[PDB]
């Protein structure tokens, strides 16, 4: 299991001084966790380093605000982790499988 959510939940924990374990996959960064979109830029930049991916977070936030998309689709842990995991697979070409404890 490439626990993409797990690593991002840890990043969020470090960001907003909160326990990682209380962040569930269906937690909304803004509505639920009470984390502003500006902090979510820093979170995404920490993901950018961690996974070695380029999150177009600027366009995703723009889609939300311009009614192209809803906030949930990019700012919920399950959806965000899926976006990340797609970009890890796309850049990797080979399988991004990594086992851990």
The domain ranges of the chain are 1-101
CATH superfamily of the 1-101 domain = ACP-like (1.10.1200.10)
Which of these, 61, 50, 52, 37, lies nearest to 11 by C-alpha position?
50
Burial class (CB in 10 A: 0-12, 13-18, 19+), 36: exposed
Q: Which experimental approach was used here? A: NMR
Which token pair is 72? 């949930």
Q: Which two tokens stand for residue 17?
A: 């001084």
Q: Are 15 and 88 in contact (CB under 8 A)?
A: no
SS3 string of the chain? CCCHHHHHHHHHHHHHCCCHHHCCCCCECCCCCCCCHHHHHHHHHHHHHHCCCCCCHHHHHHHHHCCCCCCHHHHEHHHHHHHHHHHHHHHHCCCCCCCCC
Calculated CA dihedral for residues 100, 45, 90, 63, nearest 10 degrees: 130
């Amino acid at each position: 299991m490439t626990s993409t959510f797990d690593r991002v939940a840890t990043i969020i924990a470090e960001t907003c001084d909160i326990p990682r374990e209380t962040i569930t996959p269906e937690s909304h960064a803004i509505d639920d966790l009470g984390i502003d979109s500006l902090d979510f830029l820093d979170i995404a930049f920490a993901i950018d380093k961690a996974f070695g991916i380029k999150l177009p977070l600027e366009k995703w936030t723009q889609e939300v605000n311009d009614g192209k998309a809803t906030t949930e689709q990019y700012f919920v842990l399950k959806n965000l982790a899926a976006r990340i995991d797609e970009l890890v697979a796309a850049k990797g070409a080979l399988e991004h499988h990594h086992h851990h404890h």
